[PDB]
Amino acid sequence: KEVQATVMDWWEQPVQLCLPSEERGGLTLRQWRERWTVAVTALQRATGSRS
Amino acid sequence: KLDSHLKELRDFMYPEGNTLMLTTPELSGEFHQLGSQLEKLNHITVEILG
């Protein structure tokens, strides 16, 4: 059960949400991730590449 | 004497009266329990690797 917990931590990497108010380049990590997710989604739409 | 020897040996070998017992019942029960627990451990292992 402990090993299963470790596998879970490796997959989710929870430490990325621990500093929300930190801005870099005028944006927070979340914002950056969001920007990334929108961009990844736009690329996937253009590149017909239906994920 | 012969009758007594026969009765004593028989009682020892047939503890539940109907079946010749070669293994100690207490031990036979433990083997079964250990086999069952190992099967559970093998499932958990396969599940995690998968």
mmCIF file of C-alpha atoms in Angstrom:
data_model
loop_
_atom_site.group_PDB
_atom_site.id
_atom_site.type_symbol
_atom_site.label_atom_id
_atom_site.label_comp_id
_atom_site.label_asym_id
_atom_site.label_seq_id
_atom_site.Cartn_x
_atom_site.Cartn_y
_atom_site.Cartn_z
ATOM 1 C CA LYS A 1 0.000 0.000 0.000
ATOM 2 C CA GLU A 2 2.920 2.208 0.718
ATOM 3 C CA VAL A 3 4.474 1.429 -2.631
ATOM 4 C CA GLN A 4 1.184 2.352 -4.296
ATOM 5 C CA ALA A 5 1.313 5.730 -2.544
ATOM 6 C CA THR A 6 4.784 6.346 -3.852
ATOM 7 C CA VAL A 7 3.680 5.556 -7.396
ATOM 8 C CA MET A 8 0.915 8.024 -6.991
ATOM 9 C CA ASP A 9 3.226 10.856 -5.837
ATOM 10 C CA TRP A 10 5.507 10.224 -8.825
ATOM 11 C CA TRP A 11 2.600 10.559 -11.251
ATOM 12 C CA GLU A 12 0.804 13.703 -9.709
ATOM 13 C CA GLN A 13 3.939 15.698 -8.543
ATOM 14 C CA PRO A 14 1.936 17.750 -5.938
ATOM 15 C CA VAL A 15 4.844 20.015 -4.997
ATOM 16 C CA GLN A 16 4.062 22.301 -8.165
ATOM 17 C CA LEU A 17 0.930 23.890 -6.366
ATOM 18 C CA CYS A 18 2.667 24.744 -3.134
ATOM 19 C CA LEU A 19 3.623 28.476 -4.036
ATOM 20 C CA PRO A 20 0.558 30.076 -5.822
ATOM 21 C CA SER A 21 1.463 33.791 -5.315
ATOM 22 C CA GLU A 22 4.833 33.556 -6.917
ATOM 23 C CA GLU A 23 5.021 35.421 -10.181
ATOM 24 C CA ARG A 24 7.598 35.113 -12.798
ATOM 25 C CA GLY A 25 7.438 37.085 -16.088
ATOM 26 C CA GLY A 26 4.307 38.869 -14.581
ATOM 27 C CA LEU A 27 2.337 35.483 -14.410
ATOM 28 C CA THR A 28 1.857 32.672 -11.733
ATOM 29 C CA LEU A 29 2.786 28.912 -12.453
ATOM 30 C CA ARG A 30 -0.810 28.079 -12.781
ATOM 31 C CA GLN A 31 -1.135 30.782 -15.363
ATOM 32 C CA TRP A 32 1.778 29.534 -17.149
ATOM 33 C CA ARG A 33 0.335 25.962 -17.075
ATOM 34 C CA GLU A 34 -2.890 27.288 -18.288
ATOM 35 C CA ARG A 35 -1.126 29.083 -21.077
ATOM 36 C CA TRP A 36 0.589 25.889 -21.885
ATOM 37 C CA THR A 37 -2.654 23.812 -21.796
ATOM 38 C CA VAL A 38 -4.333 26.449 -24.183
ATOM 39 C CA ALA A 39 -1.451 26.397 -26.489
ATOM 40 C CA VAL A 40 -1.256 22.582 -26.448
ATOM 41 C CA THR A 41 -4.946 22.381 -27.076
ATOM 42 C CA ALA A 42 -4.653 24.968 -30.013
ATOM 43 C CA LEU A 43 -1.826 23.038 -31.533
ATOM 44 C CA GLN A 44 -3.686 19.811 -31.250
ATOM 45 C CA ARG A 45 -6.796 21.540 -32.922
ATOM 46 C CA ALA A 46 -4.625 23.002 -35.814
ATOM 47 C CA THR A 47 -2.669 19.966 -36.349
ATOM 48 C CA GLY A 48 -5.869 18.134 -37.048
ATOM 49 C CA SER A 49 -4.131 16.057 -34.714
ATOM 50 C CA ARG A 50 -7.169 14.941 -32.884
ATOM 51 C CA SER A 51 -5.779 13.883 -29.786
ATOM 52 C CA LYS B 1 -2.488 -56.847 25.437
ATOM 53 C CA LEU B 2 -2.896 -57.150 21.747
ATOM 54 C CA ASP B 3 -6.313 -55.554 21.911
ATOM 55 C CA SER B 4 -4.898 -52.653 23.996
ATOM 56 C CA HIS B 5 -1.988 -52.070 21.606
ATOM 57 C CA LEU B 6 -4.289 -52.032 18.681
ATOM 58 C CA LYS B 7 -6.740 -49.591 20.353
ATOM 59 C CA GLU B 8 -3.901 -47.174 21.393
ATOM 60 C CA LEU B 9 -2.287 -47.059 17.957
ATOM 61 C CA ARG B 10 -5.586 -46.717 16.181
ATOM 62 C CA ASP B 11 -6.701 -43.805 18.450
ATOM 63 C CA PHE B 12 -3.477 -42.063 17.688
ATOM 64 C CA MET B 13 -3.705 -42.479 13.903
ATOM 65 C CA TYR B 14 -7.442 -41.832 13.681
ATOM 66 C CA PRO B 15 -7.975 -38.782 15.842
ATOM 67 C CA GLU B 16 -11.437 -37.798 14.191
ATOM 68 C CA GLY B 17 -12.396 -41.536 14.185
ATOM 69 C CA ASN B 18 -13.023 -41.812 10.427
ATOM 70 C CA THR B 19 -9.956 -40.861 8.555
ATOM 71 C CA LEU B 20 -6.379 -41.965 8.714
ATOM 72 C CA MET B 21 -4.439 -38.800 9.530
ATOM 73 C CA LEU B 22 -0.885 -38.497 8.364
ATOM 74 C CA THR B 23 -0.361 -34.784 9.037
ATOM 75 C CA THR B 24 -0.783 -32.966 12.280
ATOM 76 C CA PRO B 25 -4.193 -31.204 12.003
ATOM 77 C CA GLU B 26 -2.686 -28.091 13.513
ATOM 78 C CA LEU B 27 -0.013 -28.036 10.887
ATOM 79 C CA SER B 28 -2.350 -28.771 8.029
ATOM 80 C CA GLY B 29 -4.424 -25.779 9.022
ATOM 81 C CA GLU B 30 -1.367 -23.492 9.014
ATOM 82 C CA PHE B 31 -0.277 -24.603 5.510
ATOM 83 C CA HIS B 32 -3.644 -23.730 4.161
ATOM 84 C CA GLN B 33 -3.614 -20.346 5.872
ATOM 85 C CA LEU B 34 -0.130 -19.522 4.628
ATOM 86 C CA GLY B 35 -1.062 -20.494 1.026
ATOM 87 C CA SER B 36 -4.050 -18.235 1.132
ATOM 88 C CA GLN B 37 -2.083 -15.252 2.430
ATOM 89 C CA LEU B 38 0.627 -15.706 -0.293
ATOM 90 C CA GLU B 39 -1.987 -15.698 -2.983
ATOM 91 C CA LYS B 40 -3.232 -12.301 -1.727
ATOM 92 C CA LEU B 41 0.334 -10.950 -1.613
ATOM 93 C CA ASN B 42 0.921 -12.084 -5.264
ATOM 94 C CA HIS B 43 -2.248 -10.180 -6.403
ATOM 95 C CA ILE B 44 -1.223 -7.000 -4.793
ATOM 96 C CA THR B 45 2.224 -7.309 -6.451
ATOM 97 C CA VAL B 46 0.848 -7.954 -9.921
ATOM 98 C CA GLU B 47 -1.632 -5.155 -9.497
ATOM 99 C CA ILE B 48 1.132 -2.597 -8.617
ATOM 100 C CA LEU B 49 3.467 -3.723 -11.505
ATOM 101 C CA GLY B 50 0.605 -3.507 -13.883
#
